[PDB]
């Protein structure tokens, strides 16, 4: 199931929640 713009998640929209979207997916890093 999708969540997104978590942690590694996917981005949602192009903004995440937690870290800084990388392209495709949330860099928590």
Not at 7 to 26: I, L, T, W
């Amino acid at each position: 199931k999708p969540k997104c713009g978590l942690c590694r998640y996917r981005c949602c929209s192009g903004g995440c929640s937690s870290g800084k979207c990388v392209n495709g997916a949330c860099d928590c890093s």
